[PDB]
Amino acid sequence: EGREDPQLLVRVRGGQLRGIRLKAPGGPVSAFLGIPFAEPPVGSRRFMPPEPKRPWSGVLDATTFQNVCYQYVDTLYPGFEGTEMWNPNRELSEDCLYLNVWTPYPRPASPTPVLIWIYGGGFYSGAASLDVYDGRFLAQVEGAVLVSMNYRVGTFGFLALPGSREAPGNVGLLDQRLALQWVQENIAAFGGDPMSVTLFGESAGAASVGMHILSLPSRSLFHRAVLQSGTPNGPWATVSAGEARRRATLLARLVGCNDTELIACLRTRPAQDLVDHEWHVLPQESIFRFSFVPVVDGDFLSDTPEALINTGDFQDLQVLVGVVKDEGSYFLVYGVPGFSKDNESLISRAQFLAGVRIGVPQASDLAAEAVVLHYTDWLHPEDPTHLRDAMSAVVGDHNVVCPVAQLAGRLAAQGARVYAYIFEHRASTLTWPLWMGVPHGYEIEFIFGLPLDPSLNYTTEERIFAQRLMKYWTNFARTGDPNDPRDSKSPQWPPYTTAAQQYVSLNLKPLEVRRGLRAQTCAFWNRFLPKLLSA
Prior knowledge:
By secondary structure, this protein is α/β, with parallel strands linked by helices. It contains 17 helices and 16 strands. Strands 3-4-8-10-9-11-12-13-14-15-16 form an eleven-stranded mixed β-sheet, with helices on both faces. A three-stranded mixed β-sheet has the order 1-2-5, with no helix packed on it. Strand 3 and strand 4 form a beta hairpin. Helix 12 runs parallel beside helix 14.
């Protein structure tokens, strides 16, 4: 050193780091990219829990993003930003357990509240290095310390032979946990306040956050949580041990493979063989289902999330939860016949029935009939436009909106302070068709404040809008309350409650309060469908 920027040199438990000065719109920020937090989970380590990173010597360079965890890459719409922005932007590798830190520049003098981002991607994809997760805006504008980690996805992160020692399951959640511990031990070196840590994630990220809420050893590692468009409860976020055992042994067969022998065989397989086959192990033709997800092991998760939220004590928990306007549309074009991004996707009644079997793969015939009867517009039963929109609402309601409504409810009834939103603004820059509305994932760029970057062609109102969202999020992280304690000229955001069920709309207009998160329809999914299914 001596010739370097003295504000970029930091020591953590594993050694010395050199960060980087980044340009944000309103000034510079500090970035420490690709910090290892675990021993590479490679070779004999594959499928195993993460082991803490052993200290290194010299100054570890932390100026660039590290490898993305080995994963399936979606190639439905090539060169189409719509799906590309989610694709891995660094080299695929099993050596991928690294994390990233953004702080103000120079680093804060007093302890600053920390936000930890946990990306989604169906538990089979995702990376912390994507542009939409860029932490420079929250750090520069709100003065936040923002942390994000890679965790193992797909088989590498979630293949389980429940009970075995070599593939216990949930190791991707354990990766996340190890990084939360790393933050607890090391974040103060950056001016971060270990005693004010807020988790936030979207979709499988949000489900992940929920697992941590529900898993005791994770609870000491954070104080508040934001779940965007995902919950630990619901149809997709977990599988039973039996079902996970099934998929794991099926996949083993598909690649040419006593638990020990089976796992050892799997470990000799190229990463790409596992990826090439992971999608072939699902029990039905479906959308919004994923082969390798968290398992109810009776360890990380001692019971089903459903049980744990019904009987949990959430006294000291502040939670912010929400959905986008059109949770269902995005998935339709991938797996349901008749739907496309390239046309208006007007479907027939026949395709609607077929779509319901795919979107509710676990449904008996009677259950699927109830879904169809509930969602049919009996004044216009054959109308292509309603049917298309109904299909979207079926998928979005079953998978996100109702699980979220259930989660908000159970948590509130049991001590948690809960805030709920519905995000309703469609980005002016959006490359999907109008009929898809505001799809899954497209609020993220606003919360991270990308519209503050002038080169991105957002509208001025979209700039002002992103700034509000950043304040809601950072206020909530600071205090457990989205509301600005001073500015009372702005409408207030009420806690969500079982009694009143209030949540706010997030769009270009000032906050507006509403009551009931699809209450009537969610009574169907949350209270009735279970009973009808088991009978």
